[PDB]
PDB file of C-alpha atoms in Angstrom:
ATOM      1  CA  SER A   1     -11.633  17.418   4.279  1.00 15.35           C
ATOM      2  CA  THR A   2     -11.450  14.531   6.737  1.00 13.43           C
ATOM      3  CA  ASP A   3      -9.286  11.605   5.570  1.00 15.61           C
ATOM      4  CA  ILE A   4     -11.321   8.997   3.660  1.00 17.82           C
ATOM      5  CA  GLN A   5     -11.912   5.858   5.758  1.00 18.29           C
ATOM      6  CA  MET A   6     -12.244   2.533   3.929  1.00 21.04           C
ATOM      7  CA  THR A   7     -14.284  -0.054   5.841  1.00 23.69           C
ATOM      8  CA  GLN A   8     -13.232  -3.507   4.570  1.00 23.12           C
ATOM      9  CA  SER A   9     -14.916  -6.745   5.553  1.00 25.48           C
ATOM     10  CA  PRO A  10     -14.254  -9.467   6.490  1.00 26.57           C
ATOM     11  CA  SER A  11     -10.965  -9.258   8.343  1.00 26.08           C
ATOM     12  CA  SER A  12     -10.178 -12.909   7.738  1.00 27.01           C
ATOM     13  CA  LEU A  13     -11.687 -15.829   5.908  1.00 28.67           C
ATOM     14  CA  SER A  14     -11.035 -19.417   5.025  1.00 26.77           C
ATOM     15  CA  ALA A  15     -12.406 -21.314   2.057  1.00 28.22           C
ATOM     16  CA  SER A  16     -11.592 -24.274  -0.168  1.00 27.34           C
ATOM     17  CA  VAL A  17     -10.002 -24.474  -3.529  1.00 28.68           C
ATOM     18  CA  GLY A  18     -12.470 -23.308  -6.193  1.00 31.15           C
ATOM     19  CA  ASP A  19     -14.678 -21.405  -3.798  1.00 35.20           C
ATOM     20  CA  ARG A  20     -15.957 -17.902  -4.475  1.00 35.29           C
ATOM     21  CA  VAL A  21     -14.312 -15.259  -2.224  1.00 33.33           C
ATOM     22  CA  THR A  22     -16.216 -12.050  -1.649  1.00 33.31           C
ATOM     23  CA  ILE A  23     -14.688  -8.948   0.049  1.00 32.08           C
ATOM     24  CA  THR A  24     -16.427  -5.600   0.523  1.00 29.04           C
ATOM     25  CA  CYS A  25     -15.161  -2.065   1.059  1.00 28.08           C
ATOM     26  CA  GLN A  26     -17.192   0.991   1.886  1.00 29.21           C
ATOM     27  CA  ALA A  27     -15.717   4.475   1.521  1.00 31.56           C
ATOM     28  CA  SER A  28     -16.733   7.162   4.023  1.00 27.21           C
ATOM     29  CA  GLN A  29     -16.995   9.687   1.135  1.00 26.05           C
ATOM     30  CA  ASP A  30     -17.964   9.299  -2.539  1.00 27.48           C
ATOM     31  CA  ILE A  31     -14.774   8.304  -4.352  1.00 23.71           C
ATOM     32  CA  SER A  32     -16.265   7.683  -7.782  1.00 21.95           C
ATOM     33  CA  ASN A  33     -14.224   4.805  -9.252  1.00 18.71           C
ATOM     34  CA  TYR A  34     -10.881   5.690  -7.655  1.00 15.43           C
ATOM     35  CA  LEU A  35     -10.566   2.435  -5.771  1.00 15.11           C
ATOM     36  CA  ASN A  36      -7.908  -0.212  -6.213  1.00 14.54           C
ATOM     37  CA  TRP A  37      -7.569  -3.770  -4.926  1.00 11.11           C
ATOM     38  CA  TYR A  38      -4.164  -5.146  -3.934  1.00 11.21           C
ATOM     39  CA  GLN A  39      -2.822  -8.563  -3.053  1.00  7.78           C
ATOM     40  CA  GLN A  40       0.011  -8.768  -0.496  1.00  9.57           C
ATOM     41  CA  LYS A  41       1.996 -11.921   0.219  1.00 11.57           C
ATOM     42  CA  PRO A  42       4.302 -12.209   3.225  1.00 11.48           C
ATOM     43  CA  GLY A  43       7.344 -10.058   2.950  1.00 13.32           C
ATOM     44  CA  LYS A  44       6.306  -8.551  -0.370  1.00 14.55           C
ATOM     45  CA  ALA A  45       4.839  -5.249  -1.443  1.00 11.10           C
ATOM     46  CA  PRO A  46       1.174  -4.876  -2.360  1.00 12.77           C
ATOM     47  CA  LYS A  47       0.521  -6.001  -5.939  1.00 13.32           C
ATOM     48  CA  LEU A  48      -2.182  -4.279  -7.949  1.00 12.38           C
ATOM     49  CA  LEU A  49      -4.969  -6.613  -9.132  1.00 12.06           C
ATOM     50  CA  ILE A  50      -7.940  -4.382  -9.868  1.00 14.04           C
ATOM     51  CA  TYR A  51      -7.709  -0.680 -10.645  1.00 11.52           C
ATOM     52  CA  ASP A  52     -10.358   1.986 -10.932  1.00 10.66           C
ATOM     53  CA  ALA A  53     -12.870  -0.301  -9.220  1.00 11.19           C
ATOM     54  CA  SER A  54     -13.317  -2.836 -12.066  1.00  7.64           C
ATOM     55  CA  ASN A  55     -10.351  -2.987 -14.402  1.00 10.89           C
ATOM     56  CA  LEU A  56      -8.156  -6.026 -14.433  1.00  7.64           C
ATOM     57  CA  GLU A  57      -4.481  -5.270 -14.240  1.00 12.76           C
ATOM     58  CA  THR A  58      -2.288  -6.685 -16.953  1.00 15.18           C
ATOM     59  CA  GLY A  59      -1.244 -10.260 -16.350  1.00 12.82           C
ATOM     60  CA  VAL A  60      -3.749 -10.884 -13.530  1.00 13.75           C
ATOM     61  CA  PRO A  61      -6.074 -13.894 -13.913  1.00 13.41           C
ATOM     62  CA  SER A  62      -9.669 -13.161 -14.847  1.00 11.50           C
ATOM     63  CA  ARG A  63     -10.997 -14.936 -11.744  1.00 12.80           C
ATOM     64  CA  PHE A  64     -10.259 -11.638  -9.991  1.00 13.36           C
ATOM     65  CA  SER A  65     -12.849  -8.917 -10.438  1.00 14.84           C
ATOM     66  CA  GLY A  66     -14.211  -5.802  -8.845  1.00 14.86           C
ATOM     67  CA  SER A  67     -17.421  -3.826  -8.947  1.00 14.21           C
ATOM     68  CA  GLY A  68     -18.983  -0.742  -7.520  1.00 13.70           C
ATOM     69  CA  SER A  69     -18.822   3.012  -7.802  1.00 17.03           C
ATOM     70  CA  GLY A  70     -19.258   5.791  -5.267  1.00 23.24           C
ATOM     71  CA  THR A  71     -19.085   4.298  -1.805  1.00 23.06           C
ATOM     72  CA  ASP A  72     -19.730   0.562  -1.942  1.00 25.32           C
ATOM     73  CA  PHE A  73     -17.285  -1.792  -3.647  1.00 28.24           C
ATOM     74  CA  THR A  74     -16.947  -5.569  -3.950  1.00 28.73           C
ATOM     75  CA  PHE A  75     -13.922  -7.705  -4.843  1.00 30.20           C
ATOM     76  CA  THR A  76     -14.410 -11.291  -5.975  1.00 27.29           C
ATOM     77  CA  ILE A  77     -12.176 -14.255  -6.562  1.00 28.39           C
ATOM     78  CA  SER A  78     -14.469 -16.561  -8.506  1.00 26.97           C
ATOM     79  CA  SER A  79     -12.446 -19.730  -7.856  1.00 28.61           C
ATOM     80  CA  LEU A  80      -9.935 -19.583  -5.026  1.00 33.51           C
ATOM     81  CA  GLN A  81      -6.560 -21.121  -5.889  1.00 35.18           C
ATOM     82  CA  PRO A  82      -3.608 -22.048  -3.663  1.00 36.71           C
ATOM     83  CA  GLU A  83      -1.485 -19.250  -5.112  1.00 37.78           C
ATOM     84  CA  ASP A  84      -4.151 -16.720  -4.058  1.00 38.47           C
ATOM     85  CA  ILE A  85      -3.488 -17.120  -0.367  1.00 37.77           C
ATOM     86  CA  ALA A  86      -2.495 -13.604   0.738  1.00 35.62           C
ATOM     87  CA  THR A  87      -3.864 -10.547   2.441  1.00 35.68           C
ATOM     88  CA  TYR A  88      -6.052  -8.319   0.227  1.00 37.40           C
ATOM     89  CA  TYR A  89      -6.635  -4.588   0.586  1.00 35.81           C
ATOM     90  CA  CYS A  90      -8.826  -1.985  -0.973  1.00 36.91           C
ATOM     91  CA  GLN A  91      -7.258   1.479  -1.270  1.00 36.06           C
ATOM     92  CA  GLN A  92      -8.719   4.779  -2.400  1.00 35.51           C
ATOM     93  CA  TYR A  93      -6.914   7.213  -4.699  1.00 35.02           C
ATOM     94  CA  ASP A  94      -9.522   9.972  -4.887  1.00 35.59           C
ATOM     95  CA  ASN A  95      -7.640  12.287  -2.533  1.00 33.98           C
ATOM     96  CA  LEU A  96      -4.417  12.339  -0.586  1.00 37.13           C
ATOM     97  CA  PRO A  97      -3.728  10.802   1.817  1.00 36.11           C
ATOM     98  CA  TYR A  98      -4.371   7.572  -0.098  1.00 35.26           C
ATOM     99  CA  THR A  99      -5.952   5.245   2.488  1.00 35.06           C
ATOM    100  CA  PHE A 100      -6.194   1.460   2.716  1.00 33.27           C
ATOM    101  CA  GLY A 101      -8.839  -0.713   4.203  1.00 33.78           C
ATOM    102  CA  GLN A 102      -7.812  -2.864   7.137  1.00 31.06           C
ATOM    103  CA  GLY A 103      -7.202  -5.962   4.985  1.00 34.96           C
ATOM    104  CA  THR A 104      -8.625  -9.441   4.592  1.00 36.20           C
ATOM    105  CA  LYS A 105      -6.327 -12.374   5.335  1.00 37.69           C
ATOM    106  CA  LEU A 106      -7.208 -15.503   3.315  1.00 35.08           C
ATOM    107  CA  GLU A 107      -6.482 -19.071   4.225  1.00 38.20           C
ATOM    108  CA  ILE A 108      -7.350 -22.409   2.660  1.00 39.00           C
ATOM    109  CA  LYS A 109      -9.721 -24.503   4.808  1.00 39.26           C
TER     110      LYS A 109
ATOM    111  CA  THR B   1       6.459   0.698 -19.108  1.00 39.18           C
ATOM    112  CA  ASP B   2       5.513   1.051 -15.449  1.00 40.47           C
ATOM    113  CA  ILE B   3       7.906   3.144 -13.358  1.00 39.72           C
ATOM    114  CA  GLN B   4      10.277   0.943 -11.341  1.00 39.76           C
ATOM    115  CA  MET B   5      10.942   2.033  -7.761  1.00 39.44           C
ATOM    116  CA  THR B   6      14.154   0.592  -6.358  1.00 39.66           C
ATOM    117  CA  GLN B   7      13.950   0.716  -2.548  1.00 38.81           C
ATOM    118  CA  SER B   8      16.859  -0.128  -0.332  1.00 35.67           C
ATOM    119  CA  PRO B   9      17.659  -1.779   1.967  1.00 34.34           C
ATOM    120  CA  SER B  10      15.321  -4.765   2.049  1.00 35.75           C
ATOM    121  CA  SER B  11      15.751  -5.125   5.816  1.00 36.45           C
ATOM    122  CA  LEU B  12      17.748  -3.526   8.554  1.00 35.55           C
ATOM    123  CA  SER B  13      18.216  -3.720  12.266  1.00 34.89           C
ATOM    124  CA  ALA B  14      19.149  -0.809  14.480  1.00 35.94           C
ATOM    125  CA  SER B  15      18.931   0.307  18.074  1.00 35.71           C
ATOM    126  CA  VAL B  16      16.566   2.578  19.875  1.00 38.06           C
ATOM    127  CA  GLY B  17      17.826   6.085  19.371  1.00 38.67           C
ATOM    128  CA  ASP B  18      19.704   5.350  16.143  1.00 36.33           C
ATOM    129  CA  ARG B  19      19.314   7.135  12.821  1.00 37.55           C
ATOM    130  CA  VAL B  20      17.570   5.002  10.135  1.00 36.20           C
ATOM    131  CA  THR B  21      18.091   5.889   6.492  1.00 34.09           C
ATOM    132  CA  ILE B  22      16.030   4.316   3.623  1.00 30.94           C
ATOM    133  CA  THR B  23      16.359   5.194  -0.043  1.00 30.31           C
ATOM    134  CA  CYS B  24      14.188   4.978  -3.172  1.00 31.89           C
ATOM    135  CA  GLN B  25      15.203   5.481  -6.797  1.00 31.90           C
ATOM    136  CA  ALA B  26      12.705   5.973  -9.564  1.00 28.95           C
ATOM    137  CA  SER B  27      13.450   4.718 -13.075  1.00 31.22           C
ATOM    138  CA  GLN B  28      12.294   8.045 -14.536  1.00 26.99           C
ATOM    139  CA  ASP B  29      11.779  11.531 -13.148  1.00 26.50           C
ATOM    140  CA  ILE B  30       8.720  11.667 -10.885  1.00 26.35           C
ATOM    141  CA  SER B  31       9.222  15.253  -9.743  1.00 27.12           C
ATOM    142  CA  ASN B  32       8.153  15.374  -6.035  1.00 27.95           C
ATOM    143  CA  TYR B  33       5.393  12.806  -6.292  1.00 33.05           C
ATOM    144  CA  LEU B  34       6.640  10.251  -3.752  1.00 31.76           C
ATOM    145  CA  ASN B  35       4.756   8.800  -0.768  1.00 34.13           C
ATOM    146  CA  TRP B  36       6.197   6.917   2.176  1.00 33.88           C
ATOM    147  CA  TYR B  37       3.980   4.421   4.012  1.00 33.03           C
ATOM    148  CA  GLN B  38       4.489   2.591   7.278  1.00 29.75           C
ATOM    149  CA  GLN B  39       2.995  -0.906   7.646  1.00 26.61           C
ATOM    150  CA  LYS B  40       3.029  -2.186  11.196  1.00 27.00           C
ATOM    151  CA  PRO B  41       2.906  -5.937  11.602  1.00 25.58           C
ATOM    152  CA  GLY B  42      -0.551  -7.280  10.723  1.00 28.54           C
ATOM    153  CA  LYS B  43      -1.875  -3.866   9.785  1.00 27.69           C
ATOM    154  CA  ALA B  44      -2.449  -1.976   6.561  1.00 29.32           C
ATOM    155  CA  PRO B  45       0.057   0.509   5.215  1.00 29.75           C
ATOM    156  CA  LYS B  46      -0.466   4.064   6.540  1.00 30.32           C
ATOM    157  CA  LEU B  47       0.789   7.132   4.602  1.00 34.22           C
ATOM    158  CA  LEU B  48       3.351   9.126   6.677  1.00 31.99           C
ATOM    159  CA  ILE B  49       4.955  11.420   4.076  1.00 31.35           C
ATOM    160  CA  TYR B  50       3.659  12.749   0.783  1.00 30.54           C
ATOM    161  CA  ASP B  51       5.072  15.029  -1.936  1.00 30.30           C
ATOM    162  CA  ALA B  52       8.446  13.639  -0.889  1.00 28.92           C
ATOM    163  CA  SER B  53       8.786  15.720   2.317  1.00 31.80           C
ATOM    164  CA  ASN B  54       5.337  16.664   3.676  1.00 32.08           C
ATOM    165  CA  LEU B  55       4.176  15.018   6.916  1.00 31.62           C
ATOM    166  CA  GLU B  56       0.680  13.779   7.550  1.00 27.55           C
ATOM    167  CA  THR B  57      -1.378  14.398  10.636  1.00 29.85           C
ATOM    168  CA  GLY B  58       0.057  12.963  13.826  1.00 25.48           C
ATOM    169  CA  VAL B  59       3.337  11.889  12.227  1.00 21.43           C
ATOM    170  CA  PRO B  60       6.065  12.736  14.680  1.00 22.59           C
ATOM    171  CA  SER B  61       8.944  14.951  13.938  1.00 21.09           C
ATOM    172  CA  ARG B  62      11.535  12.195  13.920  1.00 17.61           C
ATOM    173  CA  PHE B  63      10.279  11.205  10.434  1.00 13.40           C
ATOM    174  CA  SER B  64      11.422  13.134   7.387  1.00 14.86           C
ATOM    175  CA  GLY B  65      11.680  12.747   3.665  1.00 15.38           C
ATOM    176  CA  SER B  66      13.806  14.379   1.008  1.00 14.23           C
ATOM    177  CA  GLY B  67      14.647  14.285  -2.679  1.00 16.39           C
ATOM    178  CA  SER B  68      13.303  15.146  -6.061  1.00 16.93           C
ATOM    179  CA  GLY B  69      13.387  13.685  -9.529  1.00 14.28           C
ATOM    180  CA  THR B  70      14.726  10.170  -9.291  1.00 15.72           C
ATOM    181  CA  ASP B  71      16.407  10.091  -5.931  1.00 15.51           C
ATOM    182  CA  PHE B  72      14.657  10.021  -2.498  1.00 17.77           C
ATOM    183  CA  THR B  73      15.465   9.421   1.167  1.00 19.86           C
ATOM    184  CA  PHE B  74      13.342   8.607   4.213  1.00 19.85           C
ATOM    185  CA  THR B  75      14.931   9.171   7.609  1.00 22.03           C
ATOM    186  CA  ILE B  76      13.991   8.316  11.172  1.00 18.27           C
ATOM    187  CA  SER B  77      16.213  10.594  13.254  1.00 17.27           C
ATOM    188  CA  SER B  78      15.982   8.593  16.471  1.00 18.25           C
ATOM    189  CA  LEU B  79      14.391   5.150  16.224  1.00 16.92           C
ATOM    190  CA  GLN B  80      11.660   4.309  18.742  1.00 19.51           C
ATOM    191  CA  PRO B  81      10.198   0.904  19.564  1.00 18.95           C
ATOM    192  CA  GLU B  82       6.864   1.748  18.006  1.00 19.89           C
ATOM    193  CA  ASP B  83       8.640   2.329  14.635  1.00 21.36           C
ATOM    194  CA  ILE B  84       9.181  -1.311  13.974  1.00 24.03           C
ATOM    195  CA  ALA B  85       7.348  -1.848  10.665  1.00 28.30           C
ATOM    196  CA  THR B  86       7.865  -2.295   6.960  1.00 27.09           C
ATOM    197  CA  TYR B  87       8.161   0.958   5.057  1.00 30.71           C
ATOM    198  CA  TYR B  88       7.288   1.499   1.395  1.00 28.18           C
ATOM    199  CA  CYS B  89       7.861   4.254  -1.087  1.00 29.77           C
ATOM    200  CA  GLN B  90       5.339   4.840  -3.852  1.00 29.69           C
ATOM    201  CA  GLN B  91       5.467   7.148  -6.876  1.00 29.53           C
ATOM    202  CA  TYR B  92       2.278   8.912  -7.959  1.00 27.42           C
ATOM    203  CA  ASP B  93       3.460  10.824 -10.973  1.00 26.10           C
ATOM    204  CA  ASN B  94       2.257   8.264 -13.575  1.00 23.24           C
ATOM    205  CA  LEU B  95      -0.352   5.487 -13.290  1.00 23.72           C
ATOM    206  CA  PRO B  96       0.017   2.869 -12.120  1.00 23.68           C
ATOM    207  CA  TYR B  97       1.288   4.368  -8.897  1.00 25.07           C
ATOM    208  CA  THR B  98       3.978   1.825  -8.208  1.00 24.23           C
ATOM    209  CA  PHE B  99       5.594   0.748  -4.962  1.00 21.64           C
ATOM    210  CA  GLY B 100       9.086  -0.004  -3.873  1.00 20.23           C
ATOM    211  CA  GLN B 101       9.774  -3.464  -2.574  1.00 19.73           C
ATOM    212  CA  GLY B 102       9.750  -2.434   1.114  1.00 23.42           C
ATOM    213  CA  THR B 103      12.184  -2.112   3.987  1.00 22.66           C
ATOM    214  CA  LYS B 104      11.601  -4.247   7.045  1.00 22.11           C
ATOM    215  CA  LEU B 105      12.897  -2.515  10.097  1.00 24.87           C
ATOM    216  CA  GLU B 106      13.720  -4.454  13.295  1.00 25.92           C
ATOM    217  CA  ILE B 107      15.374  -3.627  16.611  1.00 23.98           C
ATOM    218  CA  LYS B 108      18.921  -5.032  17.151  1.00 24.21           C
TER     219      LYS B 108
END
């Protein structure tokens, strides 16, 4: 088994407050729903937002969502807020080693 | 109810060739199910060590991990310039698979 590569796009984006943010990840192997989305702010650890492709982690605002199963996944922020400025990552958990996408750095326009 | 990983130190500085020692404590027994990731500046975290002590492909021999249960150590035997990064432990005994807070390593 080759390590699973997660292809995340875009690498950076800017948008305005309220805008819809759309990030994609494609897994190099079928990973079912074993895909998480994390938010990382400077100097902090990744924080789990979406687990098992589409489940909202406790305490996380509902503007955050995920979809997909198999190889193609999408993460959405339906209305971008100032506090959401961070780098986001997809990560797969189907098989060790757990692998991250390359990240998407968000900024406000 | 999520397992708390207490990683220390938060940051350190050391010299090329020095021994770097990072610890993680789990709030409950996680057997051997501990990962160590390296996150180089601007990059995603990359898994170096799994099952507490097993090295991934291409990880050089200066990296090691030890411990079981609640008490774990990550060691760089001889720090190299390319090792400057933030390191994270992660338990994968019980979902969610929670992370330590990180250790930011710099050169003196």
